[PDB]
Amino acid sequence: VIQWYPGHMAKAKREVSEQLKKVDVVFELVDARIPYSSRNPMIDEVINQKPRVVILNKKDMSNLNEMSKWEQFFIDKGYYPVSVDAKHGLKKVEAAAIKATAEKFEREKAKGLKPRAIRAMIVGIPNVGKSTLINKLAKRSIGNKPGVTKQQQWIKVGNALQLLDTPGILWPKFEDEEVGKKLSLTGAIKDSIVHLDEVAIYGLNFLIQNDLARLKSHYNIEVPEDAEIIAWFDAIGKKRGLIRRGNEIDYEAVIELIIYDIRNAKIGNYCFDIFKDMTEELANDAN
Ligand SMILES: Nc1nc2c(ncn2[C@@H]2O[C@H](COP(=O)(O)OP(=O)(O)OP(=O)(O)O)[C@@H](OP(=O)(O)OP(=O)(O)O)[C@H]2O)c(=O)[nH]1
């Protein structure tokens, strides 16, 4: 868990910008379940046209077809998108780094410089899998004594890649309520200010609209199509015995169950950033 406050934000921005001076290429790590909503809102200012691999992590928990639309979006921006499962295991990362830096190193070769390992770092919001990926790529878990301060080191990855063993951590998008719901549904933010009941309502409605049969079969429920959302809570709660004071619904328990099941991909593997539904937001952001 990370506590943002204005001071910490300024520090993070300054420190990451500084690490970026040290590298040839940046890996912007996003959640494949929300490849656009899991980005830091100032990421393009921080990265500042550094060659970029966008890594859509947790691909195992997302929808490939939707992911491919986001990959096209990143391609159109001049980035090199790849998807990975950092947990279950990623030789494609070194390959993407070589392509993203191809133009730079060709210009170096033309000016008569020797070849050298590519330097890279990973940047992204919290909980998207940065430390998981670094440890996997290092093939080992990355001061051990109290009060001893660890120094940032380079990790040799494959043949051509040197990877900074420390990620740059930036803050998530804060300003938009729908984005807040998306981040809570994926578990990027397990924190307050976004009411959990509204997160569960958002998640249920998403599933009703996009995977209704699977939602029903998962909880073994059948619900009238003209019922309001409360009926879904009541049905799940009834079927799972989440009741209190006789046969009233324990809504807190049902809410927590729905959220847990969506967060942990217990119902299905979804991408909650629906590209075709985000056309206006994208246009607003683009210029
Ligand atoms: N299915 C799947 N899970 C992934 C993947 N990458 C990471 N994870 C998991 O997502 C969680 C967050 O990973 P981190 O590496 O710690 O993310 P960071 O970006 O480094 O966060 P940070 O900056 O420190 O705040 C971890 O779960 P937990 O910490 O809860 O432990 P468990 O998986 O056992 O349940 C990872 O195990 C992936 O590609 N697929």
From TrEMBL:
CDD domains: YlqF (cd01856). Its main location: cytoplasm. Keywords: Cytoplasm, GTP-binding, Hydrolase, Nucleotide-binding, Ribosome biogenesis, RNA-binding. GO terms for molecular function: GTP binding; GTPase activity; RNA binding. GTP binds at N57, K58, K59, D60, N127, V128, G129, K130, S131, T132, G168. GO terms for biological process: ribosome biogenesis; translation. GO terms for cellular component: cytoplasm. It is found in: Cytoplasm. GDP binds at N57, K58, D60, A86, K87, N127, V128, G129, K130, S131, T132. InterPro entries: G_CP_dom (IPR030378), GTP-bd (IPR006073), GTP-bd_ortho_bundle_sf (IPR023179), GTP-bd_ribosome_bgen (IPR019991), GTPase_MTG1 (IPR016478), P-loop_NTPase (IPR027417). It comes from the Bacteria. It holds the Pfam family MMR_HSR1. Required for a late step of 50S ribosomal subunit assembly. Has GTPase activity. Belongs to the TRAFAC class YlqF/YawG GTPase family. MTG1 subfamily. This is Ribosome biogenesis GTPase A. It comes from Staphylococcus aureus (strain USA300).
